[PDB]
Design a protein around this nucleic acid. Sequence first.
DNA 1: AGCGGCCCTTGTGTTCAGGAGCCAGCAGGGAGCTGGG
DNA 2: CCCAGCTCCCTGCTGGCTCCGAGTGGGTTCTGCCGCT
Lengths: 360, 115, 318, 50, 123, 538, 50
Amino acid sequence: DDITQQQLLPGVKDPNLWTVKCKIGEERATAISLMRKFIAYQFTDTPLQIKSVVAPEHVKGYIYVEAYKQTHVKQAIEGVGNLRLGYWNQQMVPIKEMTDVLKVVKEKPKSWVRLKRGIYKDDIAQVDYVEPSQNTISLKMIPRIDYDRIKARMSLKDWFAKRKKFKRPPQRLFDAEKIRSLGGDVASDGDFLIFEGNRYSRKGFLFKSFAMSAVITEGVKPTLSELEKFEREHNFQPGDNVEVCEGELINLQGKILSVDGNKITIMPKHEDLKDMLEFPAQELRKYFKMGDHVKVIAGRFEGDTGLIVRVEENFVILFSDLTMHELKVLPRDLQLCSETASGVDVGGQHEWGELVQLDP
Amino acid sequence: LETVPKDLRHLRACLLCSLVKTIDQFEYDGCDNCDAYLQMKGNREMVYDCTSSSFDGIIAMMSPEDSWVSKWQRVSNFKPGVYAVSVTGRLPQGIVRELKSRGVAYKSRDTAIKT
Amino acid sequence: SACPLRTIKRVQFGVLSPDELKRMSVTEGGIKYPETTEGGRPKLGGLMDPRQGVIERTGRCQTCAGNMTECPGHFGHIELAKPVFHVGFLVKTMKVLRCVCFFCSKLLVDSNNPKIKDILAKSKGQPKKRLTHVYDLCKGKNICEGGCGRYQPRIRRSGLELYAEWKHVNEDSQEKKILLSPERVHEIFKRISDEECFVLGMEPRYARPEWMIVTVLPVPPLSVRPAVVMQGSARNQDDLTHKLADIVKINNQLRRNEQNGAAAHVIAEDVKLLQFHVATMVDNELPGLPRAMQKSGRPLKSLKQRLKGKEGRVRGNL
Amino acid sequence: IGKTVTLPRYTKRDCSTFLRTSETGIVDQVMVTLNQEGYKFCKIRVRSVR
Amino acid sequence: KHMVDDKIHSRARGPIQILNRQPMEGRSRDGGLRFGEMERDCQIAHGAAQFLRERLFEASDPYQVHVCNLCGIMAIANTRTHTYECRGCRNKTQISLVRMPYACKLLFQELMSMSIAPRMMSV
Amino acid sequence: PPIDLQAPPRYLLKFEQIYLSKPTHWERDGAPSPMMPNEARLRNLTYSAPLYVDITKTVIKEGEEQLQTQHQKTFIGKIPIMLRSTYCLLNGLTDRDLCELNECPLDPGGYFIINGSEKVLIAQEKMATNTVYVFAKKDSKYAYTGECRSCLENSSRPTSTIWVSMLARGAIGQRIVATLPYIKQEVPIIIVFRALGFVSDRDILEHIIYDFEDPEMMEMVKPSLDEAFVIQEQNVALNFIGSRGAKPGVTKEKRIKYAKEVLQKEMLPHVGVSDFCETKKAYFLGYMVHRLLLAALGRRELDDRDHYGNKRLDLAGPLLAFLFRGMFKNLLKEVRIYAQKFIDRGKDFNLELAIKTRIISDGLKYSLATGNWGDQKKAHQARAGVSQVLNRLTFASTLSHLRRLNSPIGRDGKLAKPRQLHNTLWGMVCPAETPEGHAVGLVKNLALMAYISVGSQPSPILEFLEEWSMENLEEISPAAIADATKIFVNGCWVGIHKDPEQLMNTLRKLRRQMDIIVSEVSMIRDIREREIRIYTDA
Amino acid sequence: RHGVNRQDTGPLMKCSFEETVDVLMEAAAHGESDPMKGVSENIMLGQLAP
DNA sequence: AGCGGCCCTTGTGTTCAGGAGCCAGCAGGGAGCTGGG
DNA sequence: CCCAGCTCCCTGCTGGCTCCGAGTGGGTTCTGCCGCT
Ligand SMILES: [Zn+2]
Ligand SMILES: [Zn+2]
Ligand SMILES: [Zn+2]
């Protein structure tokens, strides 16, 4: 097939392709209408001389035309509303890119998402299953149930009728005993529990289905507190000493001159080695020498500084300046930083040297 | 105008013809050039088995003989019409064997790269 | 305050290396959100990054923990998807390109050559003169010599685009006219050597030619582009803020079109638009190009205009 | 012109209009109308003897 | 119409512009008079360097900043904790306080926005 | 032009006539109110009256079935009304009535009220259109340049400016070349004539020169013939022009078509725009060339740019007319888009929904409020200054402001020539009153007795001339031109005559008797030349 | 601008005179240092001029 | 209801300071060299 | 042992870019809206 494709490659004699701007989402309709016009025009005195029309999906807002001349393309596209903008300018696709144009490329559960509108908006959720055909997805999140409503036994429709002046309930784990005490009816369906036409998990999470358009799937990232309620990576920064644990050049310590993502491709400077090597993240390891400052970005006690009396293969040991207690952390989680720990407060609730009233 | 799909809904692309039509149009007429072998007309099931609703792109061939894109898609021999850029799936194994007995080579229309 | 007071003995100028820009910036991972707030909460990854400074009066900087007055602005940065020519440096870039070859990225005249030795001796402490003379010599030359012996095309400028046009290309048919890309220029400049840079006149310590190409666009802090609380609750954003929002939008669009396969043509179009936006942000008066238009057809005010002349920062405020 | 705006010492921010600094005089007259959009709209003419 | 009462104007530390901290403009805003370029030049001719310094720096927009002695760039100075740090050099001790006009600070920031290093060598 | 659409169904949508109400204002209940001008001032309203039109929408689908419907008094916006004008509600009111309405009787009016702010339109100077001015510009590559800012009576197309330059001396001779609208290169005049359809050099020189006994003229024009010789055919010249065009069409046919369109429509529009106007266009072009030759040889003095008789004052009339023309074009475009989008689906539309009165109303308000005379989005490209806030410091100040004049030259210019007081300004402009600032000499005021014509149709004058012994340009032969007296009407060379003295006597008698020629009309007989120019321009 | 800025005075002084942005572009590109000698430079820095 | 695009009418359009001087790019022409006869 | 290319260089021209005094007091309009998704 590949050999025949070689003989099928384009040439000067073969007709060319031109790009034409068009409205978004109407490429199929435009192409069908164009063919109906050309077939109608076949019996007329002026037949369209364009050889073919392409409406790719991966590309949006554009249609391509195969024709002998641009004037032929112009005549073909004339009279079409969606091609009004395109008619002013026709772009000549290069021969090399024509094949790329024809080429097409054809190709998640337990992911964090958010909601756009509704009473559950601004609530983090985890995906359970996605049904593209039905355009709906299942999200497990912290339930929002009002206990006063259950106590007073108000209808959901009435609540929606008077929703204008009613405050939304907070986020709390579902409890069956609480509703039993409040007098509400609780039904059991296997692992899930049915209450007011909704399935609740034993743990307390609320599972519900919502439209993809309503759901948010871009620019979404949970917070640490949210992850706590619901409950590889590397930390390499400039000016840090790393060792080459694996590879031909082993037991060599270099400085982190650069930083990248999956493949860091650092340029380490080893002892008596002016030249810089190339190592990926997995080959790279974080190791430090004895009697040096170390900071922990992530760990049991993050944002802490200490000095290491030893360095075990996987359990580095340091002493926090805050208190004389041992602290064992992953060497990868460890870092070297001559700078003192800033200890900046989070959320600026209180400032350094700020009066507070613990008791009157 | 018969070759042209009647509407944008219920669109499908032939796994062999590489032609794009609607299921009802396929049943009424079928492939312009694939009728003798496929026998699509007269059986809705045959239409389902020979055409898939998942396809990528469409190109209309006004003159396949002199159309380079048609030559690239190997639809130059076919009469002018609307042909999909690529189709998903493959024809039934039994139909592949009958085509082999008939002496007509079968080639997959899955031109799109898989990743 | 505890730091000792000092006067100023000199000011060293140069170009901020992208690595230096990243290290300076407090917006880790750059900036990826054209929006300023998030339900009234200034988005950290947005333009109104609290790290970059204090937003509201009586607030405090998330970075320096200083109020309005005490706080100086802290920069952000934007990782441009593709390299982009810096309009202010465009002429110097063209001169450097004419100076070096495409392939060796070497000088079209060897340093050991007596003429270049003479120019170096003559223009000591005068990098501008050094550059002009070396540019003349490399205009004279047309091949690479211990170089690749290849044919250096002529460089032509067209607004924000550069075209390398070969006459008598090395091979029988390789290329005749190519739209040189910022990425290609950046690669050539990176390949250039430090000693060659000094010969050109650019002290490599303070200015490397590759730095001339924008890759990590700096982001001025809020104080530079302050947003004014309006009589209406709708805060009014700065012109630079709007331009940065446009640039961020184009950058995110291009980044998406890269992370997912997109037509090389649309990639080129996004690159062109991003180049135009950055160039206008630097200077909104380049002849020929369209003028960036805020709304209702009122042109923006670039940094170059801020500093340009009377009523500017220098004459108007210093 | 004592004016206030409802916020999103509470729930009200002052948006009053003061007399121009260093100026003085006596309120000549006051007129109250509705602008094109029905909003209350007051003009105050103040006269100062020079 | 032009009467002295509508033109008399004076100022002593009134409100200042937002962009730059210099005195506001116009007497309706309790602004400050413009010590213009020719005034600067006349003072230069007089040789009153200290008066010129007062007029252009201490009486218009005095400002203080912290600068890394190594890279000569403004550094983050949490005066509360007295935590002075330059990210680029990762140093904390070699930081110098520098007094300059806020307009000059703004100019330097704008240049660095233009991707220029107006490095600030206190040495 | 009426707007026609195709989805097949086709619509006409032609406008017929306008009806303008008086200033009215609606509250929430919909009650119209008579806005006292004082009320508009007080409530920051806009003194404008609603405007209306008659529209005829005829539909044809098949079988020439006409669906002609008419919508009458279609509201299309509001027009601010100059106070005390005919259509203002204070018109003709007694002093007692004005006092009752709280309006100073001595108040002269002549200003609009936009959002309660008084605004006054400053007359804007400009070079008189439809005229041939020869200027010597040694600074340029041209020894001399004739110029004509042709412009039809009324046309959305701005004035088409055409130049006819003589190249500075230094191959052998000096060549005459014309720069046309929508052409980026000059064109040999002989080439232009041949494109117009005059190949015989005899005919071309008949059009340009009128006395072939003038070897001076004829030798001086020889070099242009020498330059333009190879092109001997009208089609060849048209192809040449099309190629020279901004975007020449590869096809020679389309190039020639584009060139023919440019000649017929874009060149000397006031001479004509319809086909068969080629003879008139050729004669006018020949006259322009003749003026250039006379100036080059010094037989005729160069026109003085600052000579005020060569200037026109766009009062509120023409300025508002221009703004409204642009705005009406925008409204028609928007209605076209709306109707097209609805008919694309086969479904019909409502012209009432299509109409956006806001276009006209808001555009007029914005222009008269910001003084930016042009589209809001093109604020910079527009010229500001017009429509200043009326100066009410004193009655004298108000009168001066209402009688203000402005030169659009631009304050930045350091040329003292335009700023200088000119002799022509005698009796027309106050020689003393002028700002002493940077705008000295550029802003003027009208002398007490001064008065500006509002313009009038020259049709009755043309009819009288035809009744008279005047001979039509096409009718006459080139020979008679030499001795006869040319006759211009607003720059349109209409014909010639043989007794200019008694002709002028008749014209002056008619004007004095106020019979056919209104007072505003001006008539000039350049006795030294052989021209009689009659102007009814505003 | 030409005669003055072609001198080897200082980027800050040249920019204060004319072609501010172009002067600073050249200074940045060539990595030149202003020796803080001129009165204009000292004035801009707000330190006692010489 | 929020994001995207955009109106300069002539898609092709008038002067948004015009003019006064520097500086860069390129056409052209001559001086002189040099591999063929 | 000339010599027509061919290189190098200088002239000259054209075209492009930046500047055009200092301050002051007032005023108004505007800082999106509609089609598409
Ligand atoms: Zn801060
Ligand atoms: Zn090379
Ligand atoms: Zn530093």
